[PDB]
Design goal:
This is part of a larger assembly, with chains A (324 residues) and B (91 residues).
Chain A (H helix, E strand, L loop, with lengths): L3 H8 L16 E8 L6 E2 L4 E13 L11 E4 L12 E3 L2 E6 L7 E6 L3 E13 L11 E10 L7 E11 L11 E14 L4 E13 L2 H18 L10 H25 L8 H27 L2 H23 L1
Parallel strand pairs in A: 1-10
Antiparallel strand pairs in A: 1-3, 2-3, 3-8, 4-7, 5-9, 6-8, 7-8, 9-12, 11-12
Chain B lengths: L1 H12 L18 E9 L11 E8 L32
Antiparallel strand pairs in B: 1-2
Classes of the chains: A alpha+beta (324), B alpha+beta (91).
The structure holds a molecule of 8 linked components (NAG-NAG-BMA-MAN-MAN-MAN-MAN-MAN), a molecule of 2 linked components (NAG-NAG) and 2-acetamido-2-deoxy-beta-D-glucopyranose.
Catalytic activity (chain A): chloride(in) = chloride(out)
Subcellular location (chain A): Postsynaptic cell membrane; Cell membrane; Cell projection, Dendrite; Cytoplasmic vesicle membrane
Protein name (chain A): Gamma-aminobutyric acid receptor subunit gamma-2
């Protein structure tokens, strides 16, 4: 007994949690908010990103109305299973789960006018359709779409608060090669087989940082094709030396083509990194066939001694400006 | 109108036998099926499988769950699926 016990036992008598508030009157207006904690790693081979949020929803329920000196009933997650909660699901989430240690991480606060606030902690692997062209210099806008599952537009209308989306410090975020540029929230009505649903989207603008691949595949390949260009300084009578240099350069260019493809997923189109790999491979192959042609002629070295460094130097001005 | 919907739902769920199918001793119930393919994730050759996400949807007729006063379709909560008969569809 007491004050809050009789209030809760009077609210929950004659209550059906199956029926939404104003089931045959008007659509239920739900004000959502969110507070991102740490956007996790953006996985490119599997095409999703991880996000940890404090998803909070607010609506009105006229059955949860009490008149007393108590203004707010601050309750734990035990009262979630007794009242009505909208069936908000994330439309592009591959897998998600709430947190259940040491207690279900849910909050429930009921005001005296019927206003209900319901906050829970979620970890969501949401699908982002990252286009890997331009990679490793890509830029993406990752969405987070949520809507009610069963209730159409005529029954639940979601709405955004002005300062609903709250990000964190943006440094505890495990985004390594990317960097959150900003956020934008939108709302729209989708049409499905069951009916029309209000869909709320949050777009996360992420721009990449290539510092990682520079040491992965760029510098490494550039230094191999620099080692391709020293063959011209070796004398033409040293045939096994220069052909050993040639075969080692081409086999390791194939090896570095294979290794750098392991980071990329199995897509059909070509990327700028693959274009750079192909340009380096045809440069070293041109160097080997130029040395071969010189060997068959003696049985132009200086001519290449300037042309082959310069052709890559004009290429890098072409490649980096056009992709940046 | 909330009290009318309340007493109608309480009338529908009272005496409802979960173990018997619609027309249990009568004719086979016709179950119409709609599928909305959301995504296909991993067409894997090493495990010989594909991962498929879909909005699986079934539709049949239960004559016990019929009401006449209310003229709009009732979208109930998802927790009444443990109280209503559903088909035993598997893959
Ligand atoms: C097919 O079979 C499977 C297996 O039987 C069915 O799945 C099961 O479904 C039931 C019913 O929903 C669940 O029971 C409920 O579980 C939650 C907690 O769920 C968390 O813990 C689960 C247990 O974890 C075990 O395994 C992990 C493995 O790592 C271990 O670490 C743990 O120690 C455990 O050994 C875990 O499985 C859950 O993860 C799964 O589900 C989540 C869903 O969000 C997914 O994301 C995950 O990917 C994964 O699939 C999850 O981590 C309990 O909280 C429930 O108890 C509350 O609710 C009851 C019903 O209302 C109530 O009676 C209880 O008193 C209790 O209520 C309290 O909490 C409520 C919370 O709001 C309050 O409202 C309430 O007032 C009160 O305070 C309940 O026990 C099974 O856990 C789940 N198990 C699995 C393996 O999935 C599946 O449904 C079947 N499918 C079909 C279509 O039939
Ligand atoms: C309840 O849902 C049914 C779904 O079939 C709706 O009935 C259909 O309405 C469309 C649009 O007018 C018609 O073209 C179909 O012929 C109807 N189908 C059937 C089988 O009758 C119905 O309108 C819905 N009711 C409400 C109140 O939304
Ligand atoms: C998104 O948030 C802003 C915050 O000011 C709000 O004005 C807007 O209505 C919300 N959604 C849209 C684009 O309708």
């Amino acid at each position: 007994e007491g004050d809050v016990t009789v209030i809760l036992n009077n609210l929950l008598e004659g209550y059906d949690n199956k029926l939404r508030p104003d089931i045959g009157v008007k659509p239920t207006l739900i004000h959502t908010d969110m507070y991102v904690n740490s956007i996790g790693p953006v996985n490119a081979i599997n095409m999703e990103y991880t996000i940890d949020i404090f998803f909070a929803q607010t609506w009105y329920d006229r059955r949860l109305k009490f008149n007393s000196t108590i203004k707010v009933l601050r309750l734990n997650s035990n009262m979630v299973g007794k009242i009505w909660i909208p069936d908000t699901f994330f439309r592009n989430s591959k897998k998600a789960d709430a947190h259940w240690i040491t207690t279900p991480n849910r909050m429930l606060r009921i005001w005296n006018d019927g206003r209900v606030l319901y906050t829970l902690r979620l970890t969501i692997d949401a699908e982002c359709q990252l286009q890997l062209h331009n990679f490793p210099m890509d830029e993406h806008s990752c969405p987070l779409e949520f809507s009610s599952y069963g209730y159409p537009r005529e029954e639940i209308v979601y709405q955004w608060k002005r300062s609903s989306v709250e990000v964190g410090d943006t440094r505890s975020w495990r985004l390594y090669q990317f960097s959150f540029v900003g956020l934008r929230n939108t709302t729209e009505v989708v049409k499905t087989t069951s009916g029309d649903y209000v869909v709320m989207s949050v777009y996360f603008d992420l721009s990449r940082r290539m510092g990682y691949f520079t040491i992965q595949t760029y510098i490494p390949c550039t230094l191999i094709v620099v080692l391709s260009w020293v063959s011209f300084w070796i004398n033409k009578d040293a045939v096994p030396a220069r052909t050993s240099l040639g075969i080692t350069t081409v086999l390791t260019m194939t090896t570095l083509s294979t290794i750098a493809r392991k980071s990329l997923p199995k897509v059909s189109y070509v990327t700028a990194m693959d274009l750079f790999v192909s340009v380096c491979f045809i440069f070293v192959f041109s160097a080997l066939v130029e040395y071969g042609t010189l060997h068959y002629f003696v049985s132009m070295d200086s001519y290449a001694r300037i042309f082959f460094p310069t052709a890559f130097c004009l290429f890098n001005l072409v490649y980096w400006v056009s992709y940046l | 109108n909330m009290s009318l919907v309340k007493e109608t739902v309480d009338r529908l769920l009272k005496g409802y036998d979960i173990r018997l199918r619609p027309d249990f001793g009568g004719p086979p119930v016709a179950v119409g099926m709609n599928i909305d393919i959301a995504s296909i994730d991993m067409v894997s050759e090493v495990n010989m499988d594909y991962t498929l996400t879909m909005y699986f949807q079934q539709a049949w007729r239960d004559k016990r769950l019929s009401y006449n006063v209310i003229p709009l379709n009732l979208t109930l909560d998802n927790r009444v699926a443990d109280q209503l008969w559903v088909p035993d569809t598997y893959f």
